[PDB]
CSV table of C-alpha atoms and ligand atoms in Angstrom, one decimal:
chain,number,residue,atom,x,y,z
A,1,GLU,CA,26.5,-19.2,-21.5
A,2,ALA,CA,28.0,-19.6,-18.1
A,3,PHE,CA,26.0,-20.6,-15.0
A,4,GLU,CA,26.2,-17.3,-12.8
A,5,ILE,CA,25.4,-17.1,-9.1
A,6,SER,CA,24.1,-13.7,-8.0
A,7,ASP,CA,23.6,-12.1,-4.5
A,8,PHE,CA,20.4,-10.3,-3.5
A,9,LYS,CA,21.6,-6.8,-4.2
A,10,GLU,CA,22.7,-7.5,-7.7
A,11,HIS,CA,19.6,-9.6,-8.5
A,12,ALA,CA,17.1,-6.8,-7.2
A,13,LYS,CA,18.7,-4.3,-9.5
A,14,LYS,CA,18.1,-6.5,-12.5
A,15,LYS,CA,15.0,-8.6,-12.1
A,16,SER,CA,11.3,-7.5,-12.1
A,17,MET,CA,10.1,-10.2,-9.8
A,18,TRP,CA,10.8,-8.1,-6.7
A,19,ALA,CA,9.1,-4.9,-7.3
A,20,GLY,CA,8.1,-5.0,-10.8
A,21,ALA,CA,9.5,-3.6,-14.2
A,22,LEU,CA,12.7,-1.5,-13.5
A,23,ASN,CA,12.0,0.9,-16.4
A,24,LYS,CA,9.0,2.8,-17.6
A,25,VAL,CA,6.1,0.7,-18.7
A,26,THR,CA,2.3,1.3,-19.1
A,27,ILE,CA,0.6,0.8,-15.9
A,28,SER,CA,-3.1,-0.1,-16.1
A,29,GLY,CA,-5.3,2.0,-14.0
A,30,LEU,CA,-2.5,4.5,-12.9
A,31,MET,CA,-4.1,7.3,-10.9
A,32,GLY,CA,-3.0,10.4,-8.9
A,33,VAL,CA,-4.8,13.1,-6.9
A,34,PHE,CA,-5.0,16.6,-8.3
A,35,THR,CA,-6.5,19.6,-6.4
A,36,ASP,CA,-11.5,19.5,-4.1
A,37,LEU,CA,-9.5,16.5,-4.4
A,38,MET,CA,-10.0,14.7,-7.6
A,39,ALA,CA,-8.4,11.3,-8.6
A,40,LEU,CA,-7.6,11.4,-12.3
A,41,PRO,CA,-5.7,8.9,-14.6
A,42,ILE,CA,-2.1,9.3,-15.3
A,43,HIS,CA,-1.7,8.5,-19.1
A,44,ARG,CA,2.1,8.2,-19.1
A,45,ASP,CA,4.4,5.4,-18.6
A,46,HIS,CA,6.0,5.0,-15.1
A,47,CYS,CA,8.4,2.7,-13.4
A,48,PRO,CA,6.4,0.2,-11.2
A,49,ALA,CA,9.6,-0.5,-9.1
A,50,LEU,CA,9.8,3.1,-8.2
A,51,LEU,CA,6.3,3.4,-7.1
A,52,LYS,CA,6.7,0.1,-5.3
A,53,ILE,CA,9.6,1.3,-3.1
A,54,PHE,CA,7.3,4.4,-2.0
A,55,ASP,CA,4.6,1.7,-1.3
A,56,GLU,CA,6.9,-0.5,0.7
A,57,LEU,CA,7.8,2.4,3.2
A,58,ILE,CA,4.1,3.4,3.3
A,59,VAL,CA,2.8,-0.2,4.2
A,60,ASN,CA,5.6,-0.5,6.8
A,61,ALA,CA,4.3,2.5,8.5
A,62,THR,CA,0.6,1.4,8.1
A,63,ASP,CA,1.7,-2.1,9.6
A,64,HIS,CA,3.1,-0.4,12.6
A,65,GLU,CA,-0.1,1.5,13.0
A,66,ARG,CA,-2.0,-1.8,13.2
A,67,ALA,CA,0.4,-3.5,15.4
A,68,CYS,CA,0.2,-0.6,17.9
A,69,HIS,CA,-3.5,0.4,17.8
A,70,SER,CA,-4.1,-1.5,21.2
A,71,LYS,CA,-0.8,-0.9,23.0
A,72,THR,CA,0.1,2.1,25.4
A,73,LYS,CA,2.1,4.1,22.9
A,74,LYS,CA,0.1,3.9,19.6
A,75,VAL,CA,1.1,5.4,16.2
A,76,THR,CA,-0.6,8.9,16.0
A,77,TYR,CA,0.8,10.1,12.7
A,78,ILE,CA,2.3,8.9,9.4
A,79,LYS,CA,4.1,11.8,7.6
A,80,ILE,CA,5.0,11.3,3.9
A,81,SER,CA,7.3,14.0,2.2
A,82,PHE,CA,8.3,14.3,-1.4
A,83,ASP,CA,10.4,17.4,-2.6
A,84,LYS,CA,13.4,17.7,-4.8
A,85,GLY,CA,13.2,14.0,-5.5
A,86,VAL,CA,13.7,13.2,-1.7
A,87,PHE,CA,11.0,10.7,-0.3
A,88,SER,CA,10.5,10.3,3.3
A,89,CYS,CA,8.1,8.4,5.6
A,90,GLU,CA,8.1,9.0,9.5
A,91,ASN,CA,5.8,7.4,12.0
A,92,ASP,CA,5.9,7.6,15.9
A,93,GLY,CA,5.0,4.9,18.1
A,94,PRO,CA,7.8,2.5,19.5
A,95,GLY,CA,10.9,2.8,17.5
A,96,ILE,CA,12.8,-0.2,16.2
A,97,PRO,CA,14.9,-1.5,19.1
A,98,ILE,CA,18.2,0.0,19.4
A,99,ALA,CA,20.2,-3.3,20.4
A,100,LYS,CA,22.8,-5.5,19.1
A,101,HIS,CA,21.5,-8.4,17.0
A,102,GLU,CA,23.5,-11.4,17.9
A,103,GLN,CA,22.7,-13.6,14.9
A,104,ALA,CA,23.3,-10.7,12.3
A,105,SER,CA,26.6,-9.8,14.1
A,106,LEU,CA,28.0,-13.4,13.8
A,107,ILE,CA,26.9,-13.5,10.1
A,108,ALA,CA,28.4,-10.2,9.3
A,109,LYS,CA,31.5,-10.6,11.6
A,110,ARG,CA,31.0,-7.2,13.2
A,111,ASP,CA,28.6,-5.3,15.4
A,112,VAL,CA,25.0,-5.1,13.7
A,113,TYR,CA,22.2,-3.5,15.6
A,114,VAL,CA,18.5,-4.4,15.0
A,115,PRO,CA,17.7,-1.4,12.6
A,116,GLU,CA,20.6,-2.4,10.4
A,117,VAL,CA,18.9,-6.1,10.2
A,118,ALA,CA,15.6,-4.2,9.2
A,119,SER,CA,17.1,-2.2,6.6
A,120,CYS,CA,20.1,-4.2,5.1
A,121,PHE,CA,19.6,-7.8,5.6
A,122,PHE,CA,17.2,-9.6,3.0
A,123,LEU,CA,14.6,-12.0,4.1
A,124,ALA,CA,14.6,-10.5,7.6
A,125,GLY,CA,11.9,-8.8,9.9
A,126,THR,CA,9.4,-9.4,12.3
A,127,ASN,CA,6.8,-11.2,10.0
A,128,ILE,CA,9.0,-14.0,8.9
A,129,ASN,CA,7.1,-16.0,11.2
A,130,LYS,CA,3.7,-14.6,10.6
A,131,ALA,CA,0.6,-15.7,12.5
A,132,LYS,CA,-2.3,-17.3,10.5
A,133,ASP,CA,-4.5,-14.2,11.6
A,134,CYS,CA,-2.1,-11.5,11.0
A,135,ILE,CA,-3.5,-8.6,8.9
A,136,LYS,CA,-0.1,-6.6,8.5
A,137,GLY,CA,0.7,-6.2,4.8
A,138,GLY,CA,4.4,-7.1,5.7
A,139,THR,CA,5.4,-10.5,5.3
A,140,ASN,CA,8.6,-11.1,3.2
A,141,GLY,CA,11.3,-9.3,5.1
A,142,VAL,CA,12.5,-7.6,1.8
A,143,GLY,CA,10.6,-4.4,1.3
A,144,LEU,CA,12.6,-1.9,3.0
A,145,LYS,CA,15.7,-3.5,1.6
A,146,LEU,CA,14.3,-3.0,-1.8
A,147,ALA,CA,13.8,0.7,-1.0
A,148,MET,CA,17.5,0.8,0.0
A,149,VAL,CA,18.6,-1.0,-3.2
A,150,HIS,CA,16.9,1.5,-5.3
A,151,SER,CA,18.3,4.5,-3.5
A,152,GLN,CA,21.2,6.5,-4.4
A,153,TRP,CA,21.3,7.4,-0.6
A,154,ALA,CA,19.1,6.7,2.4
A,155,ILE,CA,19.1,7.6,6.0
A,156,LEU,CA,17.3,5.5,8.6
A,157,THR,CA,16.6,7.3,11.9
A,158,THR,CA,14.8,5.7,14.9
A,159,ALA,CA,14.4,6.6,18.5
A,160,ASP,CA,13.1,4.5,21.3
A,161,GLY,CA,12.6,7.0,24.1
A,162,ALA,CA,16.1,6.5,25.5
A,163,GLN,CA,18.3,6.6,22.5
A,164,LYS,CA,18.5,7.9,18.8
A,165,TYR,CA,19.9,5.8,16.1
A,166,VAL,CA,21.0,7.3,12.7
A,167,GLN,CA,22.6,5.3,9.8
A,168,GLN,CA,23.4,6.1,6.4
A,169,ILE,CA,22.8,3.4,3.7
A,170,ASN,CA,24.3,4.5,0.3
A,171,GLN,CA,24.9,3.6,-3.3
A,172,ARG,CA,22.1,1.0,-3.6
A,173,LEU,CA,23.0,-0.9,-0.4
A,174,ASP,CA,26.7,-1.1,-1.4
A,175,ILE,CA,27.9,1.1,1.5
A,176,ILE,CA,26.6,0.5,5.1
A,177,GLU,CA,27.9,3.3,7.3
A,178,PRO,CA,28.4,2.6,11.0
A,179,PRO,CA,25.4,4.2,13.0
A,180,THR,CA,25.5,7.1,15.2
A,181,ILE,CA,23.8,6.4,18.7
A,182,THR,CA,23.1,9.3,21.0
A,183,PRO,CA,20.7,9.8,24.0
A,184,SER,CA,17.3,11.0,23.2
A,185,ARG,CA,13.8,11.4,24.5
A,186,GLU,CA,11.9,11.2,21.1
A,187,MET,CA,10.3,8.0,19.7
A,188,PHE,CA,9.7,7.6,16.1
A,189,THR,CA,10.9,5.8,13.0
A,190,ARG,CA,12.0,7.7,9.8
A,191,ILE,CA,13.3,6.6,6.3
A,192,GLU,CA,14.5,9.2,4.0
A,193,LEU,CA,15.9,8.4,0.5
A,194,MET,CA,16.7,9.6,-3.0
A,195,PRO,CA,15.8,7.1,-5.6
A,196,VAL,CA,18.0,6.1,-8.5
A,197,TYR,CA,15.8,8.1,-10.9
A,198,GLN,CA,17.9,8.0,-13.9
A,199,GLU,CA,18.6,4.2,-13.6
A,200,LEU,CA,14.8,3.7,-13.5
A,201,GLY,CA,14.0,5.7,-16.6
A,202,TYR,CA,13.5,9.3,-15.3
A,203,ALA,CA,15.3,12.5,-15.9
A,204,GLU,CA,18.0,13.8,-13.7
A,205,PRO,CA,16.6,15.7,-11.9
A,206,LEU,CA,12.8,14.7,-12.4
A,207,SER,CA,11.2,16.6,-15.2
A,208,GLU,CA,8.2,19.0,-14.4
A,209,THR,CA,5.7,16.4,-15.7
A,210,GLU,CA,7.4,13.4,-13.9
A,211,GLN,CA,7.5,15.4,-10.7
A,212,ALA,CA,3.9,16.3,-10.9
A,213,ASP,CA,2.9,12.7,-11.9
A,214,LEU,CA,4.8,11.2,-9.0
A,215,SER,CA,3.6,13.7,-6.4
A,216,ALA,CA,0.0,13.1,-7.5
A,217,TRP,CA,0.5,9.3,-7.2
A,218,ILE,CA,2.2,9.5,-3.8
A,219,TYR,CA,-0.7,12.0,-2.7
A,220,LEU,CA,-3.4,9.3,-3.7
A,221,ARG,CA,-1.5,6.5,-2.0
A,222,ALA,CA,-1.4,8.6,1.2
A,223,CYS,CA,-5.2,9.3,0.9
A,224,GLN,CA,-5.8,5.5,0.5
A,225,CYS,CA,-3.6,5.1,3.7
A,226,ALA,CA,-5.9,7.6,5.5
A,227,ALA,CA,-9.0,5.6,4.9
A,228,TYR,CA,-7.5,2.4,6.1
A,229,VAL,CA,-5.7,3.4,9.3
A,230,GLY,CA,-7.4,3.5,12.7
A,231,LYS,CA,-9.3,6.3,14.2
A,232,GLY,CA,-6.4,7.8,16.2
A,233,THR,CA,-4.0,8.3,13.3
A,234,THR,CA,-3.4,11.1,10.8
A,235,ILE,CA,-1.6,10.9,7.6
A,236,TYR,CA,0.2,13.8,6.2
A,237,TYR,CA,1.5,14.5,2.7
A,238,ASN,CA,4.1,17.4,2.5
A,239,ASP,CA,2.7,18.4,5.9
A,240,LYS,CA,-0.9,18.6,4.7
A,241,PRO,CA,-3.3,16.2,6.5
A,242,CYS,CA,-5.0,13.8,4.3
A,243,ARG,CA,-8.7,14.2,5.2
A,244,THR,CA,-10.0,11.2,3.3
A,245,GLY,CA,-10.7,9.1,6.4
A,246,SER,CA,-13.8,7.2,4.9
A,247,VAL,CA,-14.5,5.0,2.1
A,248,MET,CA,-17.2,7.5,1.1
A,249,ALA,CA,-14.5,10.2,0.8
A,250,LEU,CA,-12.5,8.0,-1.4
A,251,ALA,CA,-15.5,7.2,-3.6
A,252,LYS,CA,-16.3,10.9,-4.1
A,253,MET,CA,-12.6,11.6,-5.1
A,254,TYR,CA,-12.6,8.9,-7.7
A,255,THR,CA,-16.0,9.9,-9.1
A,256,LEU,CA,-15.9,13.8,-8.9
A,257,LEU,CA,-14.9,14.4,-12.4
A,258,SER,CA,-17.1,11.6,-14.1
A,259,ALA,CA,-20.2,11.6,-11.8
A,260,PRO,CA,-20.5,14.7,-9.5
A,261,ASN,CA,-23.4,14.8,-7.1
A,262,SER,CA,-23.5,11.1,-7.1
A,263,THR,CA,-25.3,8.9,-4.7
A,264,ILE,CA,-23.0,6.7,-2.6
A,265,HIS,CA,-24.2,3.3,-1.5
A,266,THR,CA,-22.6,2.1,1.8
A,267,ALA,CA,-22.2,-1.1,3.5
A,268,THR,CA,-20.2,-2.6,6.3
A,269,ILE,CA,-19.5,-6.3,5.5
A,270,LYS,CA,-19.4,-8.3,8.7
A,271,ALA,CA,-18.6,-11.8,9.7
A,272,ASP,CA,-19.9,-13.6,12.7
A,273,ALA,CA,-16.8,-15.8,13.8
A,274,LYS,CA,-13.2,-14.6,14.8
A,275,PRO,CA,-10.9,-13.8,13.3
A,276,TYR,CA,-13.1,-12.4,10.5
A,277,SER,CA,-15.5,-10.9,12.9
A,278,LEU,CA,-12.6,-8.5,14.3
A,279,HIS,CA,-12.4,-7.1,10.8
A,280,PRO,CA,-15.3,-5.3,9.1
A,281,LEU,CA,-15.0,-4.5,5.6
A,282,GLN,CA,-16.1,-1.0,4.5
A,283,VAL,CA,-17.7,-0.5,1.1
A,284,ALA,CA,-18.9,2.5,-0.7
A,285,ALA,CA,-20.2,2.2,-4.4
A,286,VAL,CA,-21.4,4.7,-7.2
A,287,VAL,CA,-23.7,3.6,-10.0
A,288,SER,CA,-23.7,5.7,-13.1
A,289,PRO,CA,-24.6,5.2,-16.7
A,290,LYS,CA,-21.4,7.2,-17.5
A,291,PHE,CA,-19.1,4.5,-16.2
A,292,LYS,CA,-18.0,2.1,-19.1
A,293,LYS,CA,-16.8,-0.8,-17.2
A,294,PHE,CA,-16.7,-2.2,-13.7
A,295,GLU,CA,-14.0,-0.6,-11.6
A,296,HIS,CA,-12.8,-1.1,-7.9
A,297,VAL,CA,-10.3,0.5,-5.5
A,298,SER,CA,-9.4,-2.1,-2.8
A,299,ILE,CA,-7.3,-1.4,0.2
A,300,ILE,CA,-6.8,-4.6,2.0
A,301,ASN,CA,-4.4,-4.9,4.9
A,302,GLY,CA,-3.1,-1.6,4.0
A,303,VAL,CA,-2.2,-2.6,0.3
A,304,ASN,CA,-3.7,-1.4,-2.8
A,305,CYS,CA,-5.1,-4.8,-4.1
A,306,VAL,CA,-6.0,-4.8,-7.8
A,307,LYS,CA,-7.5,-8.3,-8.0
A,308,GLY,CA,-9.1,-10.7,-5.6
A,309,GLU,CA,-12.0,-12.9,-4.8
A,310,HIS,CA,-13.5,-10.2,-2.3
A,311,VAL,CA,-14.4,-8.2,-5.4
A,312,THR,CA,-16.0,-11.4,-7.1
A,313,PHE,CA,-18.0,-12.1,-4.1
A,314,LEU,CA,-19.7,-8.6,-4.2
A,315,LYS,CA,-20.2,-8.8,-7.9
A,316,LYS,CA,-21.7,-12.2,-7.8
A,317,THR,CA,-24.0,-11.2,-5.1
A,318,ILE,CA,-25.2,-8.1,-6.8
A,319,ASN,CA,-25.5,-9.9,-10.1
A,320,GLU,CA,-27.9,-12.6,-8.4
A,321,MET,CA,-30.3,-9.7,-7.2
A,322,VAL,CA,-30.1,-7.9,-10.4
A,323,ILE,CA,-31.0,-10.9,-12.5
A,324,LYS,CA,-34.1,-11.6,-10.3
A,325,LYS,CA,-35.3,-7.9,-10.1
A,326,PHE,CA,-34.7,-7.4,-13.9
A,327,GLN,CA,-36.6,-10.6,-15.0
A,328,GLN,CA,-39.6,-9.4,-12.7
A,329,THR,CA,-39.6,-6.0,-14.4
A,330,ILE,CA,-39.1,-7.2,-18.0
A,331,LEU,CA,-22.4,-10.6,-14.7
A,332,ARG,CA,-20.9,-8.1,-17.1
A,333,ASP,CA,-24.3,-6.3,-17.8
A,334,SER,CA,-25.1,-6.2,-14.1
A,335,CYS,CA,-21.8,-4.7,-12.8
A,336,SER,CA,-20.5,-2.7,-15.7
A,337,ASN,CA,-22.1,0.6,-14.3
A,338,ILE,CA,-20.5,0.1,-10.9
A,339,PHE,CA,-17.6,1.9,-9.3
A,340,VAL,CA,-16.8,0.5,-5.7
A,341,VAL,CA,-14.4,1.2,-2.9
A,342,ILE,CA,-13.6,-1.7,-0.4
A,343,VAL,CA,-11.3,-0.9,2.6
A,344,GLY,CA,-10.6,-3.3,5.3
A,345,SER,CA,-8.4,-6.0,6.9
A,346,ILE,CA,-8.8,-9.8,6.0
A,347,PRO,CA,-7.0,-12.4,8.0
A,348,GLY,CA,-5.2,-15.3,6.4
A,349,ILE,CA,-4.9,-14.0,2.9
A,350,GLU,CA,-1.9,-14.9,0.6
A,351,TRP,CA,-0.7,-13.1,-2.5
A,352,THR,CA,0.5,-13.9,-6.0
A,353,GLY,CA,3.9,-12.2,-5.9
A,354,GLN,CA,6.1,-9.7,-3.9
A,355,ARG,CA,4.2,-6.7,-5.2
A,356,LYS,CA,0.8,-7.9,-3.6
A,357,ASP,CA,-1.1,-6.9,-6.7
A,358,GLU,CA,-3.5,-10.0,-6.3
A,359,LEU,CA,-4.7,-11.4,-3.1
A,360,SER,CA,-5.2,-15.2,-3.0
A,361,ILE,CA,-7.9,-17.0,-1.0
A,362,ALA,CA,-10.6,-19.6,-1.2
A,363,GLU,CA,-13.9,-18.0,-2.4
A,364,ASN,CA,-15.6,-20.1,0.2
A,365,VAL,CA,-14.2,-17.8,2.9
A,366,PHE,CA,-16.7,-15.2,1.9
A,367,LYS,CA,-19.6,-17.7,1.4
A,368,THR,CA,-19.0,-19.3,4.7
A,369,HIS,CA,-18.1,-16.2,6.9
A,370,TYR,CA,-19.3,-12.9,5.6
A,371,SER,CA,-22.8,-11.2,4.9
A,372,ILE,CA,-23.4,-8.3,2.6
A,373,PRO,CA,-26.3,-6.1,4.1
A,374,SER,CA,-29.5,-6.5,2.2
A,375,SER,CA,-30.3,-2.7,2.3
A,376,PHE,CA,-27.2,-2.1,0.3
A,377,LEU,CA,-27.9,-4.9,-2.1
A,378,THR,CA,-31.5,-3.7,-2.6
A,379,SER,CA,-30.4,0.1,-3.2
A,380,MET,CA,-27.7,-1.1,-5.6
A,381,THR,CA,-30.2,-3.3,-7.5
A,382,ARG,CA,-32.6,-0.6,-8.0
A,383,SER,CA,-30.1,1.8,-9.3
A,384,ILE,CA,-28.5,-0.8,-11.7
A,385,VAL,CA,-32.0,-2.0,-13.0
A,386,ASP,CA,-33.0,1.5,-13.9
A,387,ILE,CA,-29.9,1.9,-16.1
A,388,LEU,CA,-30.7,-1.4,-17.7
A,389,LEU,CA,-34.3,-0.4,-18.4
A,390,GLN,CA,-33.3,2.7,-20.0
A,391,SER,CA,-31.1,1.0,-22.6
A,392,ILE,CA,-34.0,-1.4,-23.4
B,1,ADP,N1,8.1,2.5,9.8
B,1,ADP,C1,8.4,1.4,10.6
B,1,ADP,N2,8.1,1.4,11.8
B,1,ADP,C2,8.5,0.4,12.7
B,1,ADP,N3,9.1,-0.7,12.2
B,1,ADP,C3,9.5,-0.8,11.0
B,1,ADP,C4,9.1,0.2,10.0
B,1,ADP,N4,9.6,0.0,8.8
B,1,ADP,C5,10.1,-1.4,9.0
B,1,ADP,N5,10.0,-1.7,10.2
B,1,ADP,C6,10.5,-3.1,10.7
B,1,ADP,O1,11.5,-3.5,9.8
B,1,ADP,C7,11.3,-4.9,9.4
B,1,ADP,C8,11.7,-5.0,7.9
B,1,ADP,O2,10.7,-4.2,7.0
B,1,ADP,P1,10.4,-4.9,5.7
B,1,ADP,O3,11.8,-5.4,5.0
B,1,ADP,O4,9.4,-4.2,4.8
B,1,ADP,O5,9.7,-6.5,6.1
B,1,ADP,P2,8.2,-6.7,6.4
B,1,ADP,O6,8.1,-7.9,5.4
B,1,ADP,O7,8.3,-7.4,7.7
B,1,ADP,O8,7.4,-5.7,6.2
B,1,ADP,C9,9.7,-4.8,9.6
B,1,ADP,O9,9.4,-6.4,9.9
B,1,ADP,C10,9.5,-4.1,10.7
B,1,ADP,O10,9.8,-4.8,12.0
B,2,MG,MG1,7.4,-4.4,4.7
């Protein structure tokens, strides 16, 4: 028919490329935390874009944590809330600067302050020009805008130690209210919003099962955050601390139902050269005959990554050992009883899309730079070969 020209807002309300499907679909490997913390599958369809806007706020807070972990004022908390359908994320550390943005003001022909650029201008942020070694997850300058475009109402609040800035952003970014600016001694950034649940396939208000599923998924996402952030940061979900600060605790949570009292093989995968040497990768793995296929949970640069060559590196290395030790005794066969958690930062990665589901890298990065400790390989191989010798 006709050739139409869209704007960002209308395009994002219609197109799955930005955040995933805009209706409920079957999400492979969808999990949530249920309370002992136990991660369990959610066998109901859910809207990927809805889960992504929660993710975009959580990764923004994790990014600020990494950015500040060496400065005077660090991020000491990330507080995530979900109640009556309202989602919020708050972190301390330096606020978004409360200042006029000259370029944005000229574009919009009115006064625009920096926090309005951060929340309302597509393709805008502090990572548009991104260093080659940056390990923040943010890159595109769209994540916070997508959260606004999928919100019936939203409130951005930020304080910089001298002033507080409050701005309402309503009706899927159609209405940007002028901000309120007052003196303040607080220092934080808070986003609070109500998603357009009904447009994304949910009930108005959330049904009992929808509410329980979403709360479980957010709780697990906060727990994944807690394993990734630095030592001086606490993550809260509905004011309870998420006490899963290690890959070991995450591995336990995922295997508590299926392999209780399991042995957890641990490793720190290290590199000798900067920038890789700044960024150890923490690994915890469980080997059980009860597991039916290889599975991993990877939190890389604060993002839940479902595919990447970092996984392949580990699998290929274990497989090599398993084949040798199996042959002396007598890839799918060698790894199908493994569950592994990998958490850490990797400099210089790219992605396959806005959702950051798959990281993109040369496999030689791991061959050249990283080393998997022999004690971990030996102990994993012993456990895997025993399972294999049973079947025989
Ligand atoms: N919780 C937060 N704390 C501090 N700054 C934030 C926060 N969330 C967003 N920002 C700022 O707003 C900008 C826009 O966020 P976003 O649209 O997600 O882009 P990015 O791709 O940079 O993450 C970010 O680059 C960052 O500078
Ligand atoms: Mg972002």
